[PDB]
Amino acid sequence: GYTRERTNRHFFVSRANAFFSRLPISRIQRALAMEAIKKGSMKPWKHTKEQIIGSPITCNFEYNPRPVRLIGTVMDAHTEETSIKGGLKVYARSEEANMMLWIPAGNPKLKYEVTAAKGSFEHYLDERSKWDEAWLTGRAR
Amino acid sequence: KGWTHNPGHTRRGGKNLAWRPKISDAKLSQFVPLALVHPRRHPNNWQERQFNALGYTKWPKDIGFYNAGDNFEVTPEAAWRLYVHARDEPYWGKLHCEKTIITLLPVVEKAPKENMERVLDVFRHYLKRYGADHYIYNAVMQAAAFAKNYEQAEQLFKEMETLGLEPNAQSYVNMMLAAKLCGLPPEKSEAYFKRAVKDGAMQSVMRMDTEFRMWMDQLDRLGSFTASSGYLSVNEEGAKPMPRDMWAIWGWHRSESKFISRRDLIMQQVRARVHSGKELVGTVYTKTRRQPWAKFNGMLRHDYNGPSYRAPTIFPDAPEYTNEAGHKAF
Amino acid sequence: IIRRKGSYRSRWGNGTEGYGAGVPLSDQVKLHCVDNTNCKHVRLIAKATAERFAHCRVFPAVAHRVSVQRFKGRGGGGEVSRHRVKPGNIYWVCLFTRRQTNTRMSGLQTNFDRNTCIIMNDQRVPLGTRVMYCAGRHVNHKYHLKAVVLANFFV
Amino acid sequence: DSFKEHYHRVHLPRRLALQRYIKREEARLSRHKGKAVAAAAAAGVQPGEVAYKYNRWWVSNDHEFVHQFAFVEDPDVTREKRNTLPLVTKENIWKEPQQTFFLPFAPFVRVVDYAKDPDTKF
Amino acid sequence: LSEMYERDPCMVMWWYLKDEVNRHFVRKLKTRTAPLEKAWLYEDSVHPHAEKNPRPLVWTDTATMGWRYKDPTFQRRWSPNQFM
Amino acid sequence: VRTEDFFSKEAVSHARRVSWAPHTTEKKVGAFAKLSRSNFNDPLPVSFQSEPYFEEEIEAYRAHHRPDVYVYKYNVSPTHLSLR
Amino acid sequence: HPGLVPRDKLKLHCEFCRFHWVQDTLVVRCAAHPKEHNQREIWLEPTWTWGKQQ
Amino acid sequence: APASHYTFANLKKLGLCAPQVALSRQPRLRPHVGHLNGLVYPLPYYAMWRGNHDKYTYNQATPARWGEGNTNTMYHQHYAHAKCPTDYGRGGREFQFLSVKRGKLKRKPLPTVQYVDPNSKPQWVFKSWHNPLSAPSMWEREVQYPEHTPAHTGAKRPLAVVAPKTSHKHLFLMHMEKVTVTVSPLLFGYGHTLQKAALDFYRRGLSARSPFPSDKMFLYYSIDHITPKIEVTWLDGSVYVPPLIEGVKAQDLIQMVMEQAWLAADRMSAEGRVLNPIAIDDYKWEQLIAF
Amino acid sequence: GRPPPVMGHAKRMRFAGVDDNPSVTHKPWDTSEPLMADYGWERGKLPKFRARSPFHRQQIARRMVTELIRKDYVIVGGARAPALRILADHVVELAKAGDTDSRQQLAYFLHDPLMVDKAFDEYPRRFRDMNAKYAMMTRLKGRR
Amino acid sequence: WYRCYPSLMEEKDRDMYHCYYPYLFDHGDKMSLYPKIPDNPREWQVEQLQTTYDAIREDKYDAFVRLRAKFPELYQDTYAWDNPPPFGEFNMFYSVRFGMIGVKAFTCKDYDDLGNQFDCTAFWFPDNQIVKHSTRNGDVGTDKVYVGAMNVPVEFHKPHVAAFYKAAGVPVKHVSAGFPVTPDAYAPVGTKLDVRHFKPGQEVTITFQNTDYGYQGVMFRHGFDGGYVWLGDSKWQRRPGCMGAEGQKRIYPGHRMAGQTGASAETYDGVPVWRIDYKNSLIYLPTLIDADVGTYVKFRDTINTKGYTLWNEHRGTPPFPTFIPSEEEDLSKLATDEGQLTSPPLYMYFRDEFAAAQLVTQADVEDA
Amino acid sequence: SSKKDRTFKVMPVPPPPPATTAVEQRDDFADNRGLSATTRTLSPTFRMF
RNA sequence: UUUCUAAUUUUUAUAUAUUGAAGUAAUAUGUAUUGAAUUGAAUAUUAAAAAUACAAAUUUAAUUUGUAAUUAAUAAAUCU
RNA sequence: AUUUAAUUUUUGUAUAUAGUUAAAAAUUAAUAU
Ligand SMILES: [Zn+2]
């Protein structure tokens, strides 16, 4: 007995990467991300610094009891523009716990409003050491 | 030494789904045909071996021949030649004689003059042996109807009362049929059927106007032999010296077979003609409940090697075997 | 013993790569219990051959030993009001959180500081009064919540 | 080639030549029935036709409803597809999103008359 | 044999020709099959060969007896052999 | 809550069933809709596993004392014909 | 249903215990005590073949 | 006019959950995903019983038990009158849960009622399951025409069609009113004759076993060589002589008159005679076999 | 499905599309970077001709660039050529920019100082109007 | 495969006493309740009651055809007895529309109204047109419609290929694949298919060439264990185990082994549809396929999903031959704002939390 | 064991013509009749002296 | 096993069924005796009593009822 | 599908109480001329 395991017909082997200039891919992803800032799922971002730290107040409308509101201290800024990635990675230090969690930033239930003017390269290091000391002394030893 | 990543006994080779379907033989076995009938299990060599292995005989066409329906018949003018020969026999009972007349019908409608004396000679002689009955009266009346001699049907009917014989339930149909095929309108058959309902000899469960229709709409389905409308108007017969399928059935199961060995046909006609102290007779109950499914089902000694070999019942036949014509269709 | 099979198709990954991510926390992983009990849970060893949230604490009732760190300090009579775990008892722990990126079907992926739990009895009745930690959304299932009464709030 | 593979690599172009024959003869029978009488037995009614089977709804030996599906594709209708242009699609079809989550069947007696034909089950 | 008959009745016949052509001509592959492709199996009478005029086969079966099923792979080690 | 099967049979033949329309107390419009308030039962005892074959039954009054009324070797009844 | 090793061992224990040809095998079937007094002659399975059960 | 599917709100209320036809982890039953080689139709499971393949499909001959593929050219007293020889289909497991054919459809028209004058409005008698088989409204016509109503006899409705078929041990007074048995002892015979068959029927009727009222049976010695007559008179007065065919005996006559007793009591119930409750139930209907 | 069908890491092949998928790993799929030690058969990497070590390969990238600048032709062999022409379009991308960051980012790379003294003078004059594809890769016929 | 086996009905017992409706015997000319009485009366077997009016059948059948007219509301579904479905019209159990070729274009993350994240691969349907209609000897169930894709210079195809499209009259298409259709789902050669041929809630089946991985060993090709890291294992970190058993001598065919690892024709059976940008001819699926961008991927329909037809009454009916947009309508006017279609909520409940059944309200939280 | 005997075994005899002689044409092991009963076709032409 | 040839021993031998005999009636030494809580033909043991035929059972806590009433059913006739 | 949950019917049956299913979980899809 035996088996092919590789299909090299002209339909499968051919690639459309040549003709792909017909499609304005990103100018779709713009408009694709534009139809999500319109529904209210997301609010624009143009920030490289001035966002490495802030103060989000997360409102994950988890149906568990009620919406969870966590004061946080953003430390990712994953994408730097209004596209689909988002990614805040807020630290959020709930009450006693330390929970580096990152919001996908497109989610309708996972909303959050950051405020600038605290985007300090100091206040960021304020929390990084706070999560570096929390990370280290949590291995249960 | 445990916990295989690949649980289960999916076998390696047997995957075709046509010659090995993945169906548990517990649920697949119920389709194995243990009563398999169409890819027949009786070759053509045997069809003649099992013929003679009953004691049956092969007659030339003129005497008789297994017809298109594989039902042995006797050819008229070969029927009368029996009654010419065995009328004196001690084992020529009552209903033997009338059966001769019924066979003389597809000629007495075709030869209404040369065969209307055979009917009467069967009639006239039947009275000399057995006093007088309805068999011979219903028959000869039916014969006189087919002869299109309606006046003879009336001339026979009025002798039933003249002999006290109350006109049988048929003695109206033999007349109803006569008044129809003889070219006479209704109200000559209707007035006959309405006689029957009152005397209770015939029974009609419907308003009397419609039963008489259902009667005639069976008596024109059975159109005369010389016409061309109905079943009797068909003259085609299957000329066959032996039935093409010697194991055909007329019931539900192989042991309800159609052709029975002479040496068992006799021990059947015995029990149907003796006291019936086990099975009741003349009743729609039939205590002997048919269960031809719960009976034996397995190939015997005689399902593989075929029927035994009993020498053909055949005649040295000194009469000359001359072939000197082709005869067909009466 | 929920396994996978590294075949470029079945692969645990590391978390951070979508739901049903990876690493179901094999037999002994020294959890850090957080009930209000004797368990001082610098250690509470795990003893069931799996642990996770996608692997769904909902179903398995993961038996866990207590590789005790066994108190901060206690005293009294010989036998007292039983909340004081013996150094070797086995309890069906209810895992709260993980140190591993636990993606959910919302793209939110949480990574906590210490992977904790709350000791529960054989009959899933929490052996503790309060809880000094958060707990991911994998609780709120009627499996344990009906006894895990919302000792506190979630994340 | 195995045994069964052989029998087909020999009989595959022997069954095609057989059915292509009958059709090629089916056109012959379709001729001498034009000038001939309405219809004989001739394997049915002897155009190229398919009679309808009113006998398709059975209740099996286990008392469960078994329906036979029979579809008779019309050779004249299909060619009437491959030429003409199909109609413009109704906007109430595509502008509507197909439901995802087919919901389970709910039993019901039809109207205030309890006919309902399951015979029961209670 | 019946479960093989569901699939193709002509195959039930072809399995047996193969067993009579491989009754002598098993030795070399060319003559194992080249006869087999000379017979034409038809589950019904209608066949395209009126143009060839197949002359009927005047032949009546010889054995009135039934067919024993003998396993292919049945070995007869010793024969009535006069030298016993 | 007997036998969770719950619509496991849902089937009675056109034969071996009786008729079609019941109703409980009300009428539709037909001015005669007094039908049954009927019951919902099990089909004839074990359907055909017991008796796979049935013999042809004539109407009752045509069944009991079925008279012998023939024409030439055929039995003509007001409804049935048969070659005796 | 205890295969009564020979056919001859078959005995009708109950009034309702009768014989039956369950596919070439003479067996005893009783409505009452349905499997309690049931006996089945020893013979090949109802659907055997010539290579599997000789 | 209900909705044949539960709604989300309806389904949610009970505490249940909507069945996923979606990305669920479940099997999402779709056999034929790789096995069915060719065009597969959106009929869910039409190739499973065959073995979940589509392989052969071209042969017309199949191992056919009674009443299957090519059995149609044989006479089997059941499938002769229970399957039109045309529609005979393929083998057992090769059932046709879906048969697709090519050609122009010919839908032959339905048949119409026979011996029914058009537009003749019939009175409708409604039957159903509810009726216990004892019910007279069960064994008779459903649609009662003026055509099938015998008027030569007094009838308000066409007579019954189906009759219960059971063996009667004893000659209980079902609805008869007087069972007279006439013989002529001038006729004689040793051995089983009709003289003996009718006179034991007198004993078998007068037996201490049969619940027949012993005082309602009348013997009648005749003179003029009257063949043994058995005459039963029903409540309506219509007398009935069970034909004493030769070879008959007690259990036949006790069976003839009792079987006819249901037909005759039916005809009395058709003319309009009110009927009584009957004690005996020769047809077991309220009984189950216990052990 | 929800996770990538092939999880975080797997080497596709030479001649394989990017098939972008949500992943933590970083892939350039673009190589606009000048004078870069990213040798590989991927997209964002120039062809890695064979050598004893990524160091010694870098040492071959030095004496084959400083000999193309020194004399404007170098008859280079095999997968060094597609790996060199991208280093001739980078040197001009280094010689055009001009700022003293670049003139060192080439000074670190050339074995000899006179070259980085040449490359910044002729090339701004030479390629002032050409904006890409500065190196012509014409194949000699007789294989070594 | 249990629960997949349909109701079993033996052929030997699909006879008169079974038929759910009145069984109809045809006579060649007209249907009738009774068997055909053969005209040659000799052909009748003895003792076979050739029925011509059966008061038991005729009355059971009188109660059927009359009561259907008397009380129509109740017997509506019994009208498919004599009123069969005509050909065309998208028979629910029969019709199978073709599929359209596609191109993987990019990937995006998309969320419902609920916060369910879907890794959405967006397929571009460049230019899909019927290039040729096929068959197989004009048989039944063997009818295939071929669909072009990606309008392309006549040079980019080999002359022997492009000389085909030039014969068919279609503009030469980069690639073409053959879909099986039921004959009532044909179209004219030269129909320009449009993405709305799929409905946002449908479930499509995609087939493509999953990304080549070279010649990968066995611990990658399949899942093989093997080799302790620092616990011995001279040279055995990844080599397979015993191949045969011992005595078969014949590496049983099907040993897993090392192999070429995945440049083959892959298939996802029942992936649903997420959006449709019918202005961009984009169709978004909530899944990740393992193919290089530009991998031509053909989209049939998923046929039956969990024992239930996809295109049934309660759950959407498709644009049957194919969606042909109206004459007033064109795309050069509108914008991506208006060209966007979306789906129903694929998942019943927000999936980070459980179903409303398992999550418990405060009422039981206050257990007391 | 031994090789299987793959020779060509002769075929069994055809059926004899029907009797229609009454000369005991059926008898097989009789002195008069040679075994073969081949009265085939244009055998009367093969008139022997 | 000199070579051409002729020939009498052949992977062809016979396989156990017809018949779920199931209607036909109040009784009567007698519920023997013994052992037995009880036992009446069917607990236990005991079994050659009688007369006007029906004691090796099912059934019941015991009985009565109720099943049951010593019968046609010839594979032998080899098949070659 | 063989590391079992929560529904829902815990009523049928009787000293405790069943049975189709569904959600979730064990996370992955496969075509040689
Ligand atoms: Zn018993």
Tab-separated table of N, CA and C and ligand atoms in Angstrom, chain G residues 12-17 30 32-33 37, ligand 1:
chain	number	residue	atom	x	y	z
G	12	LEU	N	-39.138	-30.891	27.899
G	12	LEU	CA	-40.125	-29.798	28.049
G	12	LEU	C	-40.507	-29.672	29.523
G	13	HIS	N	-39.835	-28.803	30.278
G	13	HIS	CA	-40.096	-28.700	31.739
G	13	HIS	C	-41.499	-28.172	32.012
G	14	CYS	N	-41.941	-27.166	31.259
G	14	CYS	CA	-43.238	-26.505	31.565
G	14	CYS	C	-44.343	-26.867	30.575
G	15	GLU	N	-45.584	-26.562	30.925
G	15	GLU	CA	-46.686	-26.803	29.970
G	15	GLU	C	-46.444	-25.942	28.733
G	16	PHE	N	-45.948	-24.718	28.910
G	16	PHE	CA	-45.809	-23.780	27.770
G	16	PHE	C	-44.474	-23.986	27.063
G	17	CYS	N	-43.706	-24.979	27.490
G	17	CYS	CA	-42.380	-25.214	26.884
G	17	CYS	C	-42.589	-26.140	25.676
G	30	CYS	N	-40.357	-21.066	25.570
G	30	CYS	CA	-41.506	-20.995	26.490
G	30	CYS	C	-41.889	-19.540	26.679
G	32	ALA	N	-43.683	-18.562	29.217
G	32	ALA	CA	-43.514	-18.420	30.680
G	32	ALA	C	-42.085	-18.774	31.062
G	33	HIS	N	-41.548	-18.201	32.147
G	33	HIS	CA	-40.125	-18.482	32.451
G	33	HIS	C	-39.406	-18.322	31.117
G	37	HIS	N	-36.304	-21.552	31.379
G	37	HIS	CA	-36.382	-22.975	30.957
G	37	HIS	C	-36.040	-23.138	29.476
N	1	ZN	ZN	-40.809	-24.155	31.464
